[PDB]
Design a protein around this ligand. Sequence first.
Ligand SMILES: Nc1ncnc2c1ncn2[C@@H]1O[C@H](COP(=O)(O)OP(=O)(O)O)[C@@H](O)[C@H]1O
Ligand SMILES: Nc1ncnc2c1ncn2[C@@H]1O[C@H](COP(=O)(O)OP(=O)(O)O)[C@@H](O)[C@H]1O
Ligand SMILES: [Mg+2]
Ligand SMILES: [Mg+2]
Lengths: 760, 766
Amino acid sequence: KPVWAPHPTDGFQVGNIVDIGPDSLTIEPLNQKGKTFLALINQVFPAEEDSKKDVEDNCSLMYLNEATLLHNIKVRYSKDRIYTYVANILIAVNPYFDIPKIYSSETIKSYQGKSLGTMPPHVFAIADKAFRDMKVLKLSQSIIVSGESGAGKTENTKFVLRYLTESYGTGQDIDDRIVEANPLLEAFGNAKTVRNNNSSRFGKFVEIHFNEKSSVVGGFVSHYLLEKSRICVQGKEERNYHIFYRLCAGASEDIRERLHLSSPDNFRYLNRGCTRYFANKETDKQILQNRKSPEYLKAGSLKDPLLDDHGDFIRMCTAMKKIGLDDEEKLDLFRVVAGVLHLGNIDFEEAGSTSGGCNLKNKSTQALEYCAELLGLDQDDLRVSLTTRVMVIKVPLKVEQANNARDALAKTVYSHLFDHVVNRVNQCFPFETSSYFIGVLDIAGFEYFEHNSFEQFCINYCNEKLQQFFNERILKEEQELYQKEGLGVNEVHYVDNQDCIDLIEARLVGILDILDEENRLPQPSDQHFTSAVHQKHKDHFRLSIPRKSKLAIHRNIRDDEGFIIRHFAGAVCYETTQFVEKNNDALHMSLESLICESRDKFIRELFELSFISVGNKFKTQLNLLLDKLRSTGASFIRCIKPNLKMTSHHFEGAQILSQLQCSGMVSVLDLMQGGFPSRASFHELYNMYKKYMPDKLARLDPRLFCKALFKALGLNEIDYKFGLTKVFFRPGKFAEFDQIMKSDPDHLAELVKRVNHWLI
Amino acid sequence: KPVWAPHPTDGFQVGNIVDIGPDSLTIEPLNQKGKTFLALINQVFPAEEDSKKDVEDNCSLMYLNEATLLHNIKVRYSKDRIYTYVANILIAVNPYFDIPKIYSSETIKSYQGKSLGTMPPHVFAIADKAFRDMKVLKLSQSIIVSGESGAGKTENTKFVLRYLTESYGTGQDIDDRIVEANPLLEAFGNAKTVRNNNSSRFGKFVEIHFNEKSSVVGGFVSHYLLEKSRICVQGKEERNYHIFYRLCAGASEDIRERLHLSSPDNFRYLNRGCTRYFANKETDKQILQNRKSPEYLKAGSLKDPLLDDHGDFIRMCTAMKKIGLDDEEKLDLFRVVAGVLHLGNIDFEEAGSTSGGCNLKNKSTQALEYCAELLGLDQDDLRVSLTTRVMLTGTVIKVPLKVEQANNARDALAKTVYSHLFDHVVNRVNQCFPFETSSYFIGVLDIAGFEYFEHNSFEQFCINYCNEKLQQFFNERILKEEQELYQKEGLGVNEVHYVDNQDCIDLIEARLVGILDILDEENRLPQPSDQHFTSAVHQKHKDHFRLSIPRKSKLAIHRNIRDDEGFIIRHFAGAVCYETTQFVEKNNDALHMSLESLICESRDKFIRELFEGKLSFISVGNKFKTQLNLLLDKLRSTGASFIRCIKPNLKMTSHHFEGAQILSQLQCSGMVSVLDLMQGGFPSRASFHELYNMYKKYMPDKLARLDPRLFCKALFKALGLNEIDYKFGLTKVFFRPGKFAEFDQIMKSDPDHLAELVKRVNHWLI
Ligand SMILES: Nc1ncnc2c1ncn2[C@@H]1O[C@H](COP(=O)(O)OP(=O)(O)O)[C@@H](O)[C@H]1O
Ligand SMILES: Nc1ncnc2c1ncn2[C@@H]1O[C@H](COP(=O)(O)OP(=O)(O)O)[C@@H](O)[C@H]1O
Ligand SMILES: [Mg+2]
Ligand SMILES: [Mg+2]
């Protein structure tokens, strides 16, 4: 009798149905006899009889639906239980505080070799299940950690890597080198955004490699789309990459003087964003007064439970030394960071024309001197390369063009530094050969804002391709297997997004190749690119002009000023201004030659028609990643952001429900509950027990020995289902399935004995 | 200067640009000063300076666009010139009257061995180009004749076959035999529809086979999807297959009495359609009064320039006798036709409570007697098989049928007997021109043309799915492979992007989730439902570009159709809304075992030969998919030539060019896109190495010393070709449209010809 009905902020609320209408139900809310509200019949759900209980696996609920799912994970969250299963899929709700001892070395040990369901839900169990599948099925594994910005993807990725390296690594300098290399990646690739204080501005796939003995030999980090625009400008509530602030706050006085550093407000590439440090009462005392910006002295430090610019610098330097980076290497990295900062301080003024173009302002001499010294460049060569350009003819630049050459040089130098850092990290844990790998995927999900540019376009392209993988693995392949085995499982359908992917990535006519065409034209134009997209995709369902938008804020955007992509996760209107500029990874040959001919060996090694497609380079990386994903066994962790305020114990029902809906988790609740996540063929099960079986058992058809074995083990006909060639085990039966699958000879003998006792 | 701007019925109208706005052009129509209309900038095209002229190849126009194409086709049509090229593709506009001597034996001879462009555009030239390619390239050929219903596909297919057999045959009756057998195929496979008085209700692929000497050895006809529903019921403006009317109108009194025939109004399988004969003042006098239905006596005869039920019967019988069918065989065919007619006259009535079944009405005794006698069946065996169904239970037992189920068993038996008769007729025709072995073939494809009506069923669905598949072959061969070749050769030809029609194929034939497979699933269920099938289609294909619910239709006649009662398929040739009622029934080719056993165990040797507890199910859709994939493998393995037929109006009238209707066909056929791609296309090509090697034993040292490309350049220049006519690629030399004659001269391997051209090069080499 009480049901779940919609609630604007809680998602659902308890009530009683008092009336019915076509398409509607009248709901009386709990302890409010008289008051009523209407709801569409498909928005009203049965509730669990016991409202105080919680289940570890959502598949155990009497009624599995979006409302019961939300309530179950709510109750668990209020008891600081952030992990809950949906069969072998994990849901992780960001606690926004450190829950005591749930990631301890003791907690790690307790999860080792334990079947799913034998221990409470946890990321450690997902990591252990991937290890056991790799070890047993002799197949590489993938762990996909999904969710919105601030959901907890990066944190759960670290928990997976720590679990695997601590458990299946002997305990060696080599073994720790995968975990210890992380503060280095975050310093150069993470930054403070409005949604996350430690936002990842690059995607990653971290592979832990194993030998034949299922022991860690080493690892490999693949990185994607480092956000270039952040290098030069940030919003007032955002910062540039952590490294700049860690170096400004933590460097020794000798380092600060050698790099000519000062408080962040002195650098153009930092002073448009927030120049405040992450610090507490203690660490603020360790930061010298000369490193503190006026804003930091007025507003105080930024607050975060773990981020600390001074502490993170010391930790970073300690990690660098432990993984094998010497001081020379460390100082070379800092020199480039400082060089990039001084570069941003170079200002230009119009020349008297007469002679056209621009000059460096006399106030920029000191910045020019510092930048050229740190980048090992000749001062006049840098001065010339920032105010002129070559195109056959050398021509002067206007102020605006000079500001752009300076910003292009900074973005390219920094991006090349990040690539060096990722390669250097890979060089700490290399391996001659491996049998298998366990790969963890940590990358930004589908996103949109008021104004959508190339960055959003690239990320949303990635998630259109990943979505196809998710649909194919969880829905298409799973339901196909049930069909081929004649299990009669109720069919769950999905919209195929191959055409959406085609729109973007089709050869010649794909958006990426149309964009490439534009970059190779004599007069490249964003308007011309956008027109060529609309002209080449007239009848297309997925492609629309901005004037067809539902939102009024887009109706004034011209046909040649944008496009609407009807993505699987919802329509996104893109403003196409600067798509041509952002699509070029190549530095102009005049700037390229200048930096390649540096006096510094380190700088030259960063760089060891100027056009390199950002979109097509990314498509090639994405396809390689997708080939690895498709060739491996896949495990999924869906991270949930509980609120928009980074607060603990603030479960926002409506916001959480929207993520459960949008992620597609709801659409698969009935598939997953009425599914069979564990399976084995009757022949392989029979062949494994064959040498232990007596004639009475051996004479039987494989199907019949399996039947006898399951019955002797106290399994009911509900817990499993026999197909044509395979036996299938329901969710919540992983422990029993692993007991049936255990190949240990003493174990095989022991079970044959149980069968013999059951037959008598 | 005057331009082409849109016109609602003419497609385009000539006008002058007087103003310009942000998205428009203000047009003043010709000779109408002061009057104006707005058009989108994208919809206004340059016109040819000379409006009275016409060009034989549309590639010759100064401005190649849809408006100039339409006008060129129009001007030629007004001068009774129904054929026009788009390089090596032919456009054929149905004249709807006999143009004098353009298909004469004299016209046939004049096209023999002539290169494209040397003679006016004509189907004979497409047939000759296919012959020359087969002889020279040692590769089988296919001629694809496309277009909607009434466009002229069947007529142009006949012209091709007559040309090839008359030109490249023995000279005896053996070549004529392929042509002479046709009245037999049309009598059994063609019928009067609202779009065409002689509509083809089956698809065909006619192969003319050749020996090593490129001489006709024989032929082979492949047939696809004869329409089953027409055998039993037709609309008031349509008829059943021609044979029924030809036999009713032309049979001798002894034949009429032996088959117990009468006027068409006496048969259920004819009296729901139009029972009027095709006749003129003269032939109506040859039809006896006892053959004439009340409707024929009231409304008079049906009018057609060629179709005549009395005359076509005599012609059919004359053709049968000439190709080798004796009277025994002829009478056996007529007997089955009459047996099918009498079968339809068997009516049923409720049996009562005791058995919840039915009985034959006492008024149906005579029909039962006649049917059983003509089909060589026992009367009581037929009575039992039409009113009962055998079931398992494991003892064999019968279960009574309800009236509706017995009407269906009767109709299933008629459709199966008739279909088996048509298969026999196609095989018998193949037996008239067999061959032990052949080197190559020239195949002509004449499929049932794209058609839609007020109400669209499974027949239209199957027809249009096939018309779709052949548009995909055209797209793949002309618009895909062509541009890929130019790319692989580095020619830098401007890329043409067309809307593909593959997504529509996928929707229909995709495994498991395809419409054909979902329909088979439905037939295999305990309670098969059309609504359940339609729901499954909509559920598995959400937001598809080619799938839509019927209420989303543009036409008012489809907006009251329920979601589970139909679907809209967006075909390349225009959106079609299908009513899905009876899709499950029409998708079953199988006859229930009781009816199958009854017809296989006939007393008649002819009937038995027509025919060689579980579910009786054979998929019509998947059987058809398998035939089409086989045909498509054959097409993909041959050199392809295309003829695009155009229907000028919806009234079957001559000298009525409907611009808007014609333009729509030019758009939907991909001709508008082909024209674009020929602005820089190269339909003729050859390896310069293979070309150099062919002349090497004839060329002097001065030329032999040169790089192959250089001898080729010397040869092209010596032959008066300009640098604009040709283009060198990485491995091939390419020639622009309008240079076929010159390219064929370059390619001629005849040693005397090779020597003669080397002499021309030596004269050019001063
Ligand atoms: N399991 C967790 N335990 C403690 N704090 C967490 C946990 N997961 C996330 N957080 C907090 O939330 C922040 C955002 O998490 P993060 O992994 O960076 O998100 P994402 O990578 O999805 O954007 C963290 O920096 C941390 O403060
Ligand atoms: N070239 C032609 N010359 C004379 N009559 C023609 C010609 N093409 C077609 N017709 C007329 O138009 C009718 C329809 O032609 P048909 O070839 O049967 O069309 P389709 O097979 O494409 O539906 C013919 O029966 C004939 O009356
Ligand atoms: Mg992250
Ligand atoms: Mg026809």
